[PDB]
């Protein structure tokens, strides 16, 4: 629905937080091990 | 009934404008027979 | 000296007495400023109308004039490039200083170059509008016409073409008629802001100029556009617009005597147009090796086509971009009609990467909206039905772009291919993910040190279709797989997302390490 | 010699008009991406320096507007050399570290 | 007194966002600058900002009295003085590659016709 | 020293600037109802019934940076804005052009010319007397040395063969300075407003001519980049005033525009603190008078300078008064340092008289009769309202559309130049929805992110997308009865038509019909109603109490009064 200027800054922080995640996420998704030697 | 109307009203608009400039044409005749007359005779 | 003397001032015209050689548009100069052009003449006098205006000088009956025996031409100045001229060749506006050394003076109504000097149209232009650049393609020498209602982006869009020759070698000339102070300042500002003012000219008559001012404005253009064409450059015009340009022609001819004829335009209004445009194409070695392209502006009434000037110039330009007002209202935009619009020049106008790409697009979407309109009962044919309600939509995602957007040619190809493969089908109404595929394209085909020359491949070559595979297969599928898994969210469980990207090499590794580095959004190898 | 292929690759970008400027002249020790902030008009990058003749390293943002402006703050890499001017803005005011305008920068990868 | 400084702040903040997002004056718009042994030498090479950072005052000092413009005792100055000397294209205004007519390779050992007679 | 800050102000710059006086909140709450409703409408906020809403919009109003400048700068000695391009005006000359009337007709007068110190230019004007009175020929074309067509600016009865004529070879010229303000003239600056004709004080300037050293300083100007503030709901939600622009008020007749204009010229004079000018064109004696008498009754007849093209005057002079009108805005603004906001009613009018002026001196009619100078003369109108460093010159001009017909070539040219359309509907009207302003055939150029917010550009968005989607269920309500609709459909009808009565609006001039107080709504109150009413939050409040309101509090407060009131009674 219709959101007021400081919900839109909220939203954009949000956005970004979110997309730290994601980056966290990409590389728990690549389901990998220490190399051993 | 769109295409009727266009057609219609430009031959319309076309019929009015040459005759209102009929009036102007023929007020003018003597000034152009005048500029005739003084080319033909000229130099 | 001065030879001529002022008899009548009346209608806005000058009536010149005096014994003299008169010729058709031959300059009689006023003063050191002002000067007029013969309209019509005879063995002891001439009717002449103004170009100029002096606050200083009074004209007046009595006064003094010279007829320089000289046709009117066009003076070409080096400080032309990021300018407002006149059609005279005053600087309005300048960036940067003249010299005062006239580079050539060319005759307005130069005619146009016979048949033996031309050539095919067979190099794309580029518009940055991908519906345009695929769908109705553009070539190095096509006339193509913006037709549409008021205030639905035609200018807009001729803009959007002019900006995007930002790094093609392309010369941008913009001729104004009737148009107002505050939009040309306005153009000027833009062509400032997005990198292009340094290669383009604005030449201007404003809408309470003298009449034979905006009715000369086109041909000037014209006149410095083939200056430039005759020294090899490919040159952009664009009028803004040619119906402007008639009303001009129309009181210039009613003052000075002329019949009125069908619309109570002159009986030679489509002459006037034909011999404008028939100056541009594309022409041989031998007699320049450039090109002009015309983007001629017109305006319609409620949607009414079949206007006189909009269906005279229907007939002279190779195809026409029709802005519709009901997609404006809708919120479409940039606005244009697919279904009215026509592009005669075809993939001869496209390059061999961008027809193969955009191949049988047109057909699909006609077919779309064809089923859009008639879907009827709930009944559904088979699987086909929601591969066109999946395609057709991807297309119109496709279609919308924000304004003074520029998306190049080979972005726009890559995009319609992988659209043509399925790599689109995940797409659910989110903006963001077509902006970052752009982003993410453009960037790795403009600054990567191998997406530079695939995209020199791109453009020279044709390549067939299991290389196009190997080449999407191997560097920009991964890349765009993992720059959209590190901004949607809903991307991690989307169902088609996984179906279509499962087998992509991942490369969060290298790109993480790229981001690190201050690297923009798209190198994957280096920077060349 | 060295500097030779530093050369080809100079980027300068100059402003006509002068105001007072904050002269930044170093290398670019780290970069990060690009922020959209005002209603996703504008642009905005933080930006660490080591200054040349004293080694310091001082922490700046960088704002752009027009889209000259954002090309020209794309071509700053990590361990880039500049030699930048700087408009300071009146938003630095609740900032921790100032925010600056690029008025003109001389930039070589 | 009448106007805080926090609401002095604001208006600040809000006059330099009309200012940046709206421009009068085509002078505040970022621009892109374009880009016999012994005189050759003097008069094209080219030196990079890094290179002239290295430098010493003295080396700069002189390189300034070389190419005849003004000394000055700050390192900074002297570095973007010669930068913007450098820089600056005397001829090119980035508007001239436009007025370049274009070349076509030409015969560099030609047959000549018969003298005319 | 407050003997010398008081020094450099004149008594009258006293008065007006105790209008910015800080009011501290502790004083603001000792204030009673009918003080508090006296500051407002000194301040030009409107009328309010509850008290702290009006202390907080005081606080709002004050608390503003360009009001907390205008104080700060009123315990100052006074600066002076200095004029840089001022208007010059007319050269002092005689009368050195003399001749007669030769030949007669219908609004236009040949003139041949006996004794001439100079010859005759193009548009001079040559003045004759007769009985005492002073007639003005406008020169349209110079057959010869010694033989000009002339038509006439006011009047043509007594002009008869032989009358001697005069001309100092200037077009005409009017006398033009702040005195103008609070008086009626018309375009050739006849005194209109009272039988004894007090004259007005000013230099003489020539409205024709525009004063610039060369072509290219018409292009040193400043592009559009504000929106002006007119209090008006629907005018603020979805169709922003471009500030520097020009802004047309279309429909047929009875829609409603001049009591949108008179409202907007109130606006500005109390709420933006400015001057305004009114040019009428075709202007009926009757809503003339009127007019003036409204303007001299609601206070902002001092601020406003009335130029007045009457309707039964000669096409020549009512061609004028847009000129004239135009004139005094460019004064006002280059001299003084002035915004004007210039009114133009009507401009169908006054291309009107262009056409009757070209048909009269015996030139080829164009397409559908008009003017073949048509565009040019609209552009040569248009073109003089602009914004400089000076200040902004901002146009509200209303056009008369003949039978709904949008493709007449005088709306077409009138289109060219427009930066925002407002049309009326009679349909709207007749239900009693007022300003009766079409939201969704109307549009504005600055509904933009270049120039608003994103929340502005998403309500508009929502606003005119809900009320096409309510205009689109109202048919299928009607036809086959409100359960048709499905649950989602329901609830988007009762938004839309809760939406669509929220932006009828009081006005402070419609008092005389309605007899109800007008309001001035902000641009941040009208988006926190149209957001609370989008959310349905107010989904439980019956459809009349949204009529005529002012903010979205009050519709709440009469539902909650009205509910107390049933509960008491029973
Ligand atoms: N792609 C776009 N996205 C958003 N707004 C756009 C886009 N293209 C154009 N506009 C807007 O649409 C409006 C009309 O554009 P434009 O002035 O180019 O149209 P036009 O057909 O030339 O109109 P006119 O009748 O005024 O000459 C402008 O407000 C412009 O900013
Ligand atoms: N806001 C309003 N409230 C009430 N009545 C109005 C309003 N606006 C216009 N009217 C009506 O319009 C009539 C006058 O029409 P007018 O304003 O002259 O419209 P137009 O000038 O468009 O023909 C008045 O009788 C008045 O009742
Ligand atoms: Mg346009
Ligand atoms: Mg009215």
Do not use: C
């Not at chain 6, 020169?139 to 008869?160: H, M, P, Q, R």
């Not at chain 6, 629907?234 to 471009?242: A, G, K």
């Not at chain 6, 914004?387 to 017909?405: E, R």
């Amino acid at each position: 629905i219709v959101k007021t200027e400081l919900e839109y800054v909220e939203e954009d922080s949000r956005l970004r937080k979110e997309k730290i995640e994601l980056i966290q996420k990409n590389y728990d998704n690549l389901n990998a091990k220490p190399l051993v030697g | 009934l769109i295409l009727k109307w266009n057609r219609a009203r430009k031959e319309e608009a076309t019929l009015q404008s040459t005759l209102l400039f009929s009036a102007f044409k023929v007020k003018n005749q003597k000034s152009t027979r005048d500029e005739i007359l003084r080319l033909s005779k000229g130099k | 000296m001065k030879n001529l003397k002022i008899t009548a001032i009346k209608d806005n015209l000058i009536f010149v007495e005096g014994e003299h050689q008169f010729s058709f548009l031959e300059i009689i100069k006023f003063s050191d400023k002002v000067e007029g052009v013969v309209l019509k003449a005879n063995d002891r006098s001439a009717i002449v109308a103004i170009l100029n205006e002096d606050k200083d000088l009074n004209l007046t009956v009595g006064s003094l004039a010279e007829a320089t025996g000289e046709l009117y031409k066009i003076p070409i100045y080096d400080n032309y490039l990021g300018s407002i001229i006149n059609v005279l060749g005053e600087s309005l506006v300048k960036q940067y200083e003249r010299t005062n050394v006239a580079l050539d003076k060319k005759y307005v109504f130069t005619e146009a170059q016979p048949i033996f000097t031309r050539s095919a149209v067979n190099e794309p232009l580029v518009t940055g509008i991908t519906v345009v650049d695929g769908v109705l393609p553009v070539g190095r020498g096509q006339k193509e016409l913006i037709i549409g209602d008021r205030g639905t982006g035609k200018t807009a869009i001729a803009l959007n073409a002019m900006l995007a020759q930002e790094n093609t070698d392309v010369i941008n000339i913009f001729i104004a008629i009737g148009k107002k102070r505050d939009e040309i300042v306005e153009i000027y500002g833009t062509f400032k802001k997005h990198n292009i003012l340094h290669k383009s000219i604005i030449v201007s008559a404003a809408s309470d100029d003298a009449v034979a001012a905006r009715y000369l404005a086109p041909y000037a253009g014209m006149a410095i556009a083939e200056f430039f064409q005759q020294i090899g450059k490919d040159v952009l015009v664009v009028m803004d617009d040619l119906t402007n340009h008639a009303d001009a022609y129309r009181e210039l001819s009613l003052l000075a005597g002329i019949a009125p004829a069908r619309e109570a335009y002159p009986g030679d209004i489509f002459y006037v147009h034909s011999s404008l445009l028939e100056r541009g194409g594309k022409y041989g070695p031998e007699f320049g090796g450039g090109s002009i392209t015309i983007l001629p502006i017109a305006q319609t009434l409620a949607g009414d086509i079949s206007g006189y000037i909009p269906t005279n110039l229907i007939s002279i330009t190779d195809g026409q971009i029709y802005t519709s007002a009901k997609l404006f209202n809708e919120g479409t935009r940039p606005a244009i009609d697919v279904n009215l619009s026509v592009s005669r020049l075809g993939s001869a106008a496209q390059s061999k990467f961008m027809a193969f790409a955009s191949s049988g697009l047109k057909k699909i979407y006609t077919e779309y909206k064809y089923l859009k309109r008639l879907s009827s009962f709930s009944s559904k044919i088979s699987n086909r039905d929601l591969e066109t309600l999946q395609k057709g939509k991807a297309f119109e995602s496709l279609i919308d772009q924000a304004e003074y957007e520029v998306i190049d040619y080979e972005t726009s190809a890559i995009l319609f291919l992988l659209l043509k493969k399925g790599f689109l089908n995940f797409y659910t109404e989110k903006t963001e993910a077509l902006k970052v595929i752009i982003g993410v394209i453009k960037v790795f085909l403009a600054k990567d040190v191998l997406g530079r020359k695939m995209r020199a491949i791109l453009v020279e070559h044709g390549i067939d279709s299991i290389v196009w595979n190997l080449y999407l297969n191997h560097m920009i599928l991964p890349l765009l797989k993992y720059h959209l898994l590190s901004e949607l969210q809903y991307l991690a469980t989307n169902r088609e997302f996984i179906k279509k990207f499962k087998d992509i090499r991942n490369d969060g590794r290298i790109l993480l390490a790229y981001e690190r580095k201050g690297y923009e959004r798209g190198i994957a190898y280096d920077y060349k | 010699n060295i500097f030779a292929n530093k050369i080809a690759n100079q980027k300068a970008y100059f402003k006509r008009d002068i105001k007072t400027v904050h002269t930044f002249l170093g290398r670019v020790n780290y970069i990060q991406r690009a922020s959209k902030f005002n209603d996703e008009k504008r642009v905005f990058r933080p930006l660490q320096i080591e200054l040349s003749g004293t080694n310091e390293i001082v922490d700046i943002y960088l704002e752009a507007t027009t889209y000259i402006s954002k090309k020209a703050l794309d071509e700053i890499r990590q361990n880039s050399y500049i030699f930048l001017e700087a408009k300071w803005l009146p938003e630095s005011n609740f900032l921790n570290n100032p925010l600056f305008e690029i008025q003109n920068i001389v930039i070589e990868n | 007194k009448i106007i805080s400084e926090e609401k002095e702040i604001l208006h600040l903040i809000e006059q330099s966002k009309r200012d940046r997002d709206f421009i009068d004056n085509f002078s505040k718009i970022l621009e892109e600058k374009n880009l016999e042994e012994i005189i050759h030498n003097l008069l094209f090479k080219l030196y990079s900002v890094e290179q002239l950072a290295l430098f010493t005052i003295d080396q700069l000092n002189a390189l300034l009295f070389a190419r005849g413009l003004g000394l000055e005792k700050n390192k900074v100055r002297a570095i973007k003085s010669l930068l913007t000397l450098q820089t600056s294209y005397e001829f090119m205004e980035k508007s001239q590659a436009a007025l370049l007519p274009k070349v076509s390779f030409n015969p560099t050992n030609p047959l000549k016709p018969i003298e005319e007679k | 020293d407050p003997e010398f800050v008081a020094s450099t102000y004149t008594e009258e710059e006293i008065i007006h600037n105790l209008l910015f006086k800080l009011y501290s909140v502790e004083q603001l709450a000792l204030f009673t109802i009918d003080q508090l409703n006296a500051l407002l409408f000194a301040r030009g906020l409107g009328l309010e019934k509850n008290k702290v809403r009006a202390i907080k919009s005081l606080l709002t109003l004050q608390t503003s940076y360009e009001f907390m400048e205008k104080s700060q700068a009123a315990l100052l000695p006074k600066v002076s804005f200095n004029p840089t391009n001022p208007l010059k005006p007319i050269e002092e000359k005689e009368f050195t052009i003399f001749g007669e009337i030769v030949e007669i007709r219908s609004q236009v007068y040949k003139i041949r010319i006996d004794k001439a110190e100079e010859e005759v230019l193009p548009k001079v004007i040559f003045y004759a007397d007769v009985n005492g009175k002073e007639i003005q020929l406008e020169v349209a074309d110079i057959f010869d040395k010694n033989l000009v067509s002339t038509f006439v600016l006011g009047n043509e009865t007594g002009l008869k063969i032989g009358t001697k004529v005069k001309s100092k070879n200037q077009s005409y010229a009017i006398k033009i300075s702040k005195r103008l303000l609070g008086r009626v003239i018309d375009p050739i600056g006849k005194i209109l407003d009272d039988s004894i004709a007090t004259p007005v004080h000013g230099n003489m300037y020539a409205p024709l001519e525009m004063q610039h050293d060369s072509e290219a300083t018409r292009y040193v100007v400043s592009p559009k980049n504000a929106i002006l503030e007119t209090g008006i709901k629907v005018i603020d939600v979805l169709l922003p005033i471009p500030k520097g622009g020009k802004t047309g008020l279309l429909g047929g007749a009875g829609v409603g525009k001049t009591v949108i204009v008179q409202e907007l010229i109130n606006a500005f004079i109390k709420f933006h603190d400015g001057v305004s000018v009114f040019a009428g064109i075709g202007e009926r004696i009757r809503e003339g008078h009127e007019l003036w008498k409204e303007a001299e009754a609601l206070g902002f007849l001092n601020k406003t300078a009335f130029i007045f093209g009457q309707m039964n005057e000669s096409p020549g002079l009512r061609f004028r008064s847009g000129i004239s009108g135009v004139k005094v805005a460019e004064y006002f603004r280059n001299n003084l340092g002035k915004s004007v906001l210039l009114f133009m009613d009507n401009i169908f009018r006054y291309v009107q008289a262009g056409s009757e002026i070209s048909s009269l001196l015996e030139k080829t009619p164009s397409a559908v009769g008009y003017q073949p100078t048509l565009f040019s003369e609209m552009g040569q109108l248009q073109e003089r309202i602009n914004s400089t460093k000076d200040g902004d010159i901002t146009s509200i001009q209303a056009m008369y559309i003949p039978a709904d017909d949008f493709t007449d070539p005088a709306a077409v040219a009138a289109f060219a130049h427009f930066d925002s359309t407002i049309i009326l509907s009679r349909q709207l009207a007749a239900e009693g929805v007022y300003p009766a302003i079409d939201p969704l055939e109307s549009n504005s150029k600055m509904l933009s992110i270049k120039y608003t917010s994103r929340e502005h550009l998403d309500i508009a968005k929502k606003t005119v997308q809900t009320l096409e989607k309510t205009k689109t269920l109202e048919d299928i309500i009607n036809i086959l009865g409100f359960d048709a609709l499905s649950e989602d459909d329901k609830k988007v009808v009762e938004v839309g038509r809760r939406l669509k009565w929220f932006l009828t609006q009081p006005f402070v001039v419609a008092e005389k019909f309605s007899g109800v107080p007008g309001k001035f709504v902000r641009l941040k109150d009208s988006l926190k109603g149209i957001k609370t009413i989008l959310d349905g939050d107010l989904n439980h409040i019956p459809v009349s109490y949204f009529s005529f309101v002012g903010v979205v509090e009050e519709i709440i407060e009469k539902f909650n009064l009205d509910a107390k009131k049933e509960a008491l009674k029973n």
